[PDB]
Amino acid sequence: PVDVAFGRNYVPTWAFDHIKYFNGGNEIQLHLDKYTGTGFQSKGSYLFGHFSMQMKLVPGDSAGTVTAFYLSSQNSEHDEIDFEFLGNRTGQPYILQTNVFTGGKGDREQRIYLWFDPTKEFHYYSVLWNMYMIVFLVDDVPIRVFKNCKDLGVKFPFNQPMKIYSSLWNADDWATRGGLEKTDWSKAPFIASYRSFHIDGCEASVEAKFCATQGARWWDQKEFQDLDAFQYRRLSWVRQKYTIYNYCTDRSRYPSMPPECKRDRDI
Numbered sequence: 001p002v003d004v005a006f007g008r009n010y011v012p013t014w015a016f017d018h019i020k021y022f023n024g025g026n027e028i029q030l031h032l033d034k035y036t037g038t039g040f041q042s043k044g045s046y047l048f049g050h051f052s053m054q055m056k057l058v059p060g061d062s063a064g065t066v067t068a069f070y071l072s073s074q075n076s077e078h079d080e081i082d083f084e085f086l087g088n089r090t091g092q093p094y095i096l097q098t099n100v101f102t103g104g105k106g107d108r109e110q111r112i113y114l115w116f117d118p119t120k121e122f123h124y125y126s127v128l129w130n131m132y133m134i135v136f137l138v139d140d141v142p143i144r145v146f147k148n149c150k151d152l153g154v155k156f157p158f159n160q161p162m163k164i165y166s167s168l169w170n171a172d173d174w175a176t177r178g179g180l181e182k183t184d185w186s187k188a189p190f191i192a193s194y195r196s197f198h199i200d201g202c203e204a205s206v207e208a209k210f211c212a213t214q215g216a217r218w219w220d221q222k223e224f225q226d227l228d229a230f231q232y233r234r235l236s237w238v239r240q241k242y243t244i245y246n247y248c249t250d251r252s253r254y255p256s257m258p259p260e261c262k263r264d265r266d267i
């Protein structure tokens with residue numbers, strides 16, 4: 001990931017005055033108070049690529065807040081790849097929730113705790129999205145893989161260009177302790193910080209759902225068809241030690257377990 005200024009790749013979409021720009025936009029702060037949160041989105045749309053953000057989450061009491069960094073297509077039957085950071089009362093742990101929507105259908109939530117305090121320093125949160133798989137990374141650690149399992153009849157984000165989005169907003173009904181902990185608005189403003197703003201992707205308009213260099217990109221090469229053994233060991237550790245919720249092993253919601261799971265090593 002190469003660090004660039006916000007304005008190279010992104011535009012604000014809501015509550016422009018709630019985005020504070022530092023060092024020429026090399027760092028931004030998103031602010032949330034009782035009237036409004038805020039968000040931004042990429043200027044371009046992409047079909048496959050490598051997308052990365054450095055983030056430092058809301059310090060102190062962040063209960064009820066969600067800081068999101070995600071890719072989404074536009075139409076109905078949408079595809080989406082999500083990082084959703086769920087805050088907490090002071091000194092209680094953040095959750096990093098991930099999710100994948102295909103053809104308008106999600107319900108693929110996983111929730112992890114992190115192996116560092118995400119409010120203390122900036123860390124990298126990244127998506128690698130190619131025709132074979134989607135990988136979610138925290139720094140150099142893969143925390144989830146969503147493989148292209150079209151051969152098993154599972155849909156995959158495959159031809160809908162997506163924009164990159166980020167936002168900070170209240171989500172009282174479900175964010176903290178499943179919705180039991182409500183935002184304490186006397187602790188506003190809640191501030192999330194971002195750097196890097198890295199986009200390396202196959203630019204593709206909604207107009208045309210194609211990129212003229214498809215298959216010729218570095219992420220289309222053979223080495224990116226799968227994670228290597230080292231990366232899978234790091235992933236298994238996240239699965240065994242840091243995962244508090246995993247749609248794959250949730251037999252109450254999925255008596256009929258999803259086909260991707262064994263392949264993704266979420267089993």
Ligand SMILES: *[C@@H]1O[C@H](CO)[C@@H](O[C@@H]2O[C@H](CO)[C@@H](O[C@@H]3O[C@H](CO)[C@@H](O)[C@H](O)[C@@H]3O)[C@H](O)[C@H]2NC(C)=O)[C@H](O)[C@H]1NC(C)=O
Binds near residue numbers: 088093244
């Ligand atoms: C915010 O902090 C609270 C603690 O105040 C976190 O809630 C705790 O979540 C853990 C993991 O889900 C729970 O522990 C687990 O309990 C189950 C049994 O239900 C057990 O199977 C596991 O081995 C594990 O011990 C814990 O009960 C729960 N505590 C409370 C008071 O709710 C929460 O995860 C933090 N994050 C967010 C965004 O809520």
